[PDB]
Design a protein around this nucleic acid. Structure first.
Length: 1286
RNA sequence: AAUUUCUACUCUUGUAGAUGUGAUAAG
DNA sequence: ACCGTAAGGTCTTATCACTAAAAGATCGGAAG
DNA sequence: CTTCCGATCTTTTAGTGATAAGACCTTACGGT
């Protein structure tokens, strides 16, 4: 049977380890003597300077080459029509093939494959393109061939400095290559020409022809405009709006001139302005052009053709000077008065040609109406009333369709205009103040930062209010208004960058982390570790007395001339050097070393005799033409490749080809001098392998080997004394002298990599392409605790509760002798300074660093296959599996509940206190000082980083519990729900990154306490999750992690699953609440218990219900008799008490009050004096008076009893009371503190997340196909949970 | 308040947990 | 004959490298 | 003095099986 410990060694997980390098002995002096550090700093600076220069070179070549492009566009135009009329499936494929043909036609001009050009020019362009991604670029002769290039001697020197050092730019080459490619990617020249801009030019041509046939007298008028602006004077407008004139408009200059022609100089009226001035003339020609599409769409800018911006601020003087410059620029251009003029002229421009961006709509609603759903509902009821399928169409037309001003102003009423005239004026006044208020001289004191905050916030608010209006294409925006708005919004755009960079400056760390790569004059330092490449890569490792060292062997007198160390007997004292033998992935390195050689390809183009290779083979290897054709069949499926089996079904031929190729590779590995000594006998016979991928997957871990050999101490000591070797110690905290605790995981991986059992059978592979870095000393103002001073502990006598950070400073001042702190003065503990601690010590000196990749589970495949199916097979085999439901609460940060297969609670606990530190108290103190500091940037930074650290603790807690229970873990799916600001870790991005980090942990889970050979140890990590791809694509399951939608897990009664069905937003008007009271059946006072019982049937009040029918037909809502009940501990509490938020002016006041609904209802009943306490029906005797006050307070009472969560942070109350009693006749109360049910109200949400996990697991168990339901609908959940509890 | 780096600390010249880096596009 | 509901087809996902040896460029020295 | 050749440094080179699910649009059947 399958087992939980079988979830290991399933797929390779690549990681990297970072270490500090401590220079041993003389090395630093030599590094200071040769000056590698300074030249690497200079090289990094030159690379940063040189990237835009090479971009300018690429721009120059692109503009030089695009001018030769001449094509006839009629065929692709015809395909565009044929698709747009027919939508036939042949048309889309024909259009894609036509677009590919045109992309290839464009791409041939760059690479020089254009038959429309002369052979000499074509060859010249081919040479230029192939030289542009080579060392030939830096040697400068490609710039000699590429005429009229504007570099100076300094730029030429920057190019020459990277000669023989092209490897720095390889990633930049890998990027910029795709720009010139014929691929269908967005960021390419042919894609931008043929798919983005050309349909728009076609639309322009057709729109122009239609308008010309409609109004002939417009023709000369349009021509006159072209005579006015004076663009394209050599040709007529009739020829401009034609297909061959798209032989121009390829370079960025012509694109800008065409757009300037359409829009006018930003004066001279463009075509669009002339069309709308014609349409405002109100004649029959204006009417007929109004009947036609009457605007041109401007073309997109060309690729790589992209301004008030600067680098991030280094000092408060720098940011204050730059922002003073920006405010001076705003006052000089007098932007705010142009904003005011725009916000006047909105009242006169025709509102049908002005549009709002739909995605801003709800925000504007909260800007102009009471709630964020008001205006959206207003447009919905308008678009319905102006008329399920129609409802869907209205939803579609409001979800992704921009709205004109006329419709909005007609829908929400005239008062919005006044409100709009309010809002703009208010913000403008703030902006005006922000321009008149002086800047502070510095930002060392709080109010100075508050002034900068307020000014940036006001400017950014005015930017947002400008951002309300849509500028997107296909909206019929007025040209004059769009030009004005785009102009002012462009002028105000740098305010956003100023806000972001000032927030980063006020949030940034006092040190600098920035560091640069070291090369030691070697273009391939540490690119690999093989002993044959030891000479050209320079980097080696040593082990001595459990310490690890890195040796860099520099070039001597410009030559390599690498020394060699003889091995010695193991008893002799000295270092142990790694001997690393590797032959990389077999699939690429056998056809490289045997069959794609130039000699054999030359031979088999002219002969058929098999060729005997001899060089680098211990015995000659014959290659037969049949094998080379098996690798090079001139068709994309190779005959041994599984694509051939898919294409033909020639299973016998596939197996014959596979056997032949595998036998050939066995012969090669038996003969090639790197691999001839390897014992290949572990491999199965060649015919047994099902596919080639299986063969390579089993083969590859044999070609890797590490051994160690001892070297005498003197041989290495003399080499490092001479300067032939730079010996560094690979260091971290766990190699320190005082190290006594448990090591890091990255120390565990490093130690496990060189364990003898790992060398016997490789589980973690040491990867090549390591990288050395150097971090310079920061401008750190030193702070250190001097001898004889007092050190102040942040914890109290109990380690749980921390000192509030506002009090810590004055406490630390007081105990060094430099009233809440007075109150807690005997609560604090101080220490003598035994040894000086330096604040942020590792940035006080310049340090070398070493980034080394490793690969864990090296024996396994490169990627998991059907991992979810394996997990679901195990879950089906073990229905007894516990379920761990995870939720984030309001009074504890994360609460967990582990439930059994029966739904019984196994464990429930909060994660406030992790490692005896109460993170909730810390976050509460930070929030308190955040409100105290009026939301400064520093405190919110130190809150976000604290939440990140807390979740990094949560990951270990979660995974320890998961290993202990061997349980599936079910988490909140963030795609569906939303969480209030009252909840800690409310931010969606932070918890999303926590779930990503949990997936990343659980892929390669290693537990510190376990032995390395045990499953879960260093050499056998648990793999309980699939590789993360994306949040929107991970779906409802990743391995053992289940993701269930958030809603109806917190506000639900655990005993019988009752949820309040109503939406109170549709009740507040008097007629609605009257109908709501009418719709209940009846309620009565229980003479025996003193309760009131109200009976509701689920088929009533459909206008007030949400759209989710439950499973139960009816509910008996109970007003419990208020009575001092007692919990399991014995403290009294009032049964049935509700805590309700006080509302004034339709907003939450931030105050709560306590209600006792039974006592209040008795007070109501005796005040009305109608007879009760007899079992009679109360409801008609109440509503027959038609007293509006009675119905108002009745609806208030009903809404009060249906309040599930009742909480007040000030008194500390946080509980759930069910207003419904189950088959045992008892109402739920978390305040009884019974272990069987969620003890505190935050536990209830995690319990129901676990129950949704049980829902998915039960549907999996009933199914036959190892798949989850791909989602839980709220109807299905609100049926299942109360059906299960009856 | 010390760290390959981050977060929270201080019986311990350090503790507990986390940690896939680099390049390029981009948010 | 028109509309409502359910099933199928396809679009789309930030990627790459984690490398030793073959191939080519460079250059210093020897032969005629 | 040019040309050819050997050592050496640097740039380029081979490439295997594997998916997989949320979402939007289109199609076909059933109900009125």
């Amino acid at each position: 049977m399958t087992q939980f410990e079988g979830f290991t060694n399933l797929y390779q997980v690549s990681k990297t380890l970072r270490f500090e390098l401590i220079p041993q002995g003389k090395t630093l002096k030599h590094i200071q003597e040769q000056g590698f550090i300074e030249e690497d700093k200079a090289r990094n600076d030159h690379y940063k300077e040189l990237k835009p220069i090479i971009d300018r070179i690429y721009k120059t070549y692109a503009d030089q080459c695009l001018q030769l492009v001449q094509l006839d566009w009629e065929n692709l135009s015809a395909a565009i029509d044929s698709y747009r009329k027919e939508k036939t499936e042949e048309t889309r494929n024909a259009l894609i093939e036509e677009q590919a043909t045109y992309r290839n036609a464009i791409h041939d001009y760059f690479i020089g494959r254009t038959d429309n050009l002369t052979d000499a020019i074509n060859k010249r362009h081919a040479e230029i393109y192939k030289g542009l991604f080579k060392a030939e670029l830096f040697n400068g002769k490609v710039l000699k061939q590429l005429g009229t290039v504007t570099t100076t001697e300094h730029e030429n020197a920057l190019l020459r400095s990277f000669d023989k050092f092209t490897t720095y730019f390889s990633g930049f080459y890998e990027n910029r290559k795709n720009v010139f490619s014929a691929e269908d990617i967005s960021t390419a020249i042919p894609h931008r020409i043929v798919q983005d801009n050309f349909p728009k030019f076609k639309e322009n041509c057709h729109i122009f022809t239609r308008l010309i046939t409609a109004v002939p007298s417009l023709r000369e008028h349009f021509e006159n405009v072209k005579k006015a602006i004076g663009i394209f004077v050599s040709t007529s407008i009739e020829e401009v709006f034609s297909f061959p004139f798209y032989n121009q408009l390829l370079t960025q200059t012509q694109i800008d001139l065409y757009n300037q022609l359409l829009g006018g100089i930003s004066k001279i009226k463009g075509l669009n302005e002339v069309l709308n001035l014609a349409i405002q003339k109100n004649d029959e020609t204006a009417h007929i052009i109004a009947s036609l599409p009457h605007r041109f769409i401007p073309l997109f800018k060309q690729i790589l053709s992209d301004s008030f911006i600067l680098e991030e601020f280094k000092s408060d003087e720098e940011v204050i000077q730059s922002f003073c410059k920006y405010k001076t620029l705003l006052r000089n251009e007098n932007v705010l008065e142009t904003a005011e003029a725009l916000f006047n002229e909105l009242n006169s421009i025709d509102l049908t040609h002005i549009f709002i961006s739909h995605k801003k709509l709800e925000t504007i609603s909260s800007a102009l109406c009471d709630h964020w759903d008001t205006l959206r509902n207003a447009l919905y009821e308008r678009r319905i009333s102006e008329l399920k399928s129609a409802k869907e169409k209205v939803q579609r037309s409001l979800k992704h369709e921009d709205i004109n001003l006329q419709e909005i102003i007609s829908a929400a009423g005239k008062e919005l205009s006044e409100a709009f005239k309010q809002k703009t004026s208010e913000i403008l006044s703030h902006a005006h103040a922000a321009l008149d208020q002086p800047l502070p001289t510095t930002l060392k004191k709080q109010e100075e930062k508050e002034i900068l905050k307020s000014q940036l916030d006001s400017l950014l608010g005015l930017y947002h209010l400008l951002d309300w209006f849509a500028v997107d294409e296909s909206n019929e925006v007025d040209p004059e208004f769009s030009a004005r708005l785009t102009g002012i919004k462009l002028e105000m755009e740098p305010s956003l960058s100023f806000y972001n960079k000032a927030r980063n400056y006020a949030t940034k760390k006092p040190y600098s982390v920035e560091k640069f790569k070291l090369n030691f004059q070697m273009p391939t330092l540490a690119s690999g570790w093989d002993v044959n490449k030891e000479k050209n890569n320079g980097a080696i490792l040593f082990v001595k007395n459990g310490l690890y060292y890195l040796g860099i062997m520099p070039k001597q007198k410009g030559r390599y001339k690498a020394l060699s160390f003889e091995p010695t007997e193991k008893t002799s004292e000295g270092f142990d050097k790694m001997y690393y033998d590797y032959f990389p992935d077999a699939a690429k390195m056998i056809p490289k070393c045997s069959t794609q050689l130039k000699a054999v390809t030359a031979h088999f183009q002219t002969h058929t005799t098999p060729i005997l290779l001899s060089n680098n083979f211990i015995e000659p290897l014959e290659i037969t033409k049949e094998i080379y054709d098996l690798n090079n069949p001139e068709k994309e499926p190779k005959k041994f490749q599984t694509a051939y089996a898919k294409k033909t079904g020639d299973q016998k031929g596939y197996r014959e080809a596979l056997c032949k190729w595998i036998d050939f590779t066995r012969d090669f590995l038996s003969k090639y001098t790197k691999t001839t000594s390897i014992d290949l006998s572990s491999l199965r016979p060649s015919s047994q392998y099902k596919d080639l991928g299986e063969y390579y997957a089993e083969l590859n871990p044999l070609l890797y080997h590490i051994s160690f050999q001892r070297i005498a101490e003197k041989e290495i000591m003399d080499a490092v004394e001479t300067g032939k070797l730079y010996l560094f110690q690979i260091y971290n905290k766990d190699f320190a002298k005082g190290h006594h605790g448990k090591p890091n995981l990255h120390t565990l991986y490093w130690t496990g990599l060189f364990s003898p059992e790992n060398l016997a059978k490789t589980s973690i592979k040491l990867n090549g392409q390591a990288e050395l870095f150097y971090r310079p000393k920061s401008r750190m103002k030193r702070m250190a605790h001097r001898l004889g001073e007092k050190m102040l502990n942040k914890k109290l006598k109990d380690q749980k509760t921390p000192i509030p950070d506002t009090l810590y400073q004055e406490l630390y001042d007081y105990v060094n002798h430099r009233d809440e702190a007075r109150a807690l003065l005997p609560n604090v503990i101080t220490k003598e300074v035994s040894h000086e601690i330096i604040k942020d010590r590792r940035f006080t000196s310049d340090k070398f660093f070493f980034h080394v990749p490793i690969t864990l589970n090296y024996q396994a495949a490169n990627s998991p296959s059907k991992f979810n199916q394996r997990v679901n097979a195990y879950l089906k085999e073990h229905p007894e599996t516990p379920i761990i439901g995870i939720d984030r609460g309001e009074r504890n940060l994360i609460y967990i509940t582990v439930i059994d297969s029966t739904g019984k609670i196994l464990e429930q606990r909060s994660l406030n206190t992790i490692q005896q530190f109460d993170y909730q108290k810390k976050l509460d103190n930070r929030e308190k000082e955040r409100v105290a500091a009026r939301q400064a940037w520093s405190v919110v930074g130190t809150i976000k980083d604290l939440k990140q650290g807390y979740l990094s603790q949560v990951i270990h807690e979660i995974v320890d519990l998961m290993i202990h229970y061997q349980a599936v873990v079910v988490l909140e799916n963030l795609n569906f729900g939303f969480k209030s600001k009252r909840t800690g870790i409310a931010e969606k991005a932070v918890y999303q990154q926590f779930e990503k980090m949990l997936i990343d942990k659980l892929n390669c889970l290693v537990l510190k306490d376990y032995p390395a050979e045990k499953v879960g140890g260093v050499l056998n990590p648990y793999q309980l999750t699939d590789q993360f791809t994306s949040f929107a694509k991970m779906g409802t399951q990743s391995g053992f992690l289940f993701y269930v939608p958030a809603p109806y897990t917190s506000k639900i009664d655990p005993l019988t699953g009752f949820v309040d069905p109503f939406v109170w937003k549709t009740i507040k008007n008097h007629e609605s609440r009257k109908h709501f009271l009418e719709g209940f059946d009846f309620l009565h006072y229980d003479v025996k218990t003193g309760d009131f019982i109200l009976h509701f049937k689920m088929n009533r009040n459909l206008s007030f219900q949400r759209g989710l029918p439950g499973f139960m037909p009816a509910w008996d809502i109970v007003f419990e008799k208020n009575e001092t009940q007692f919990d399991a501990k014995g403290t009294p509490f009032i049964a049935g008490k509700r805590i309700v938020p006080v509302i004034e002016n339709h907003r939450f006041t931030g105050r709560y009050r306590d209600l006792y609904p039974a006592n209040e209802l008795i007070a109501l009943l005796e005040e009305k004096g109608i007879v009760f306490r007899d079992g009679s029906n109360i409801l008609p005797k109440l509503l027959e008076n038609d007293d509006s006050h009675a119905i108002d307070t009745m609806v208030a009472l009903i809404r009060s009893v249906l309040q599930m969560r009742n909480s007040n942070a000030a008194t500390g109350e946080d509980y759930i009371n069910s207003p419904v009693r189950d088959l045992n006749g008892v109402c739920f109360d978390s305040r009884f503190q019974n272990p069987e049910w969620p003890m505190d109200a935050d536990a209830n949400g995690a319990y129901h997340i676990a129950l949704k996990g049980q829902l998915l697991l039960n549907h999996l168990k009933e199914s036959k196909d190892l798949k989850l339901q791909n989602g839980i609908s709220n109807q299905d959940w609100l049926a299942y949970i109360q059906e299960l509890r009856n």
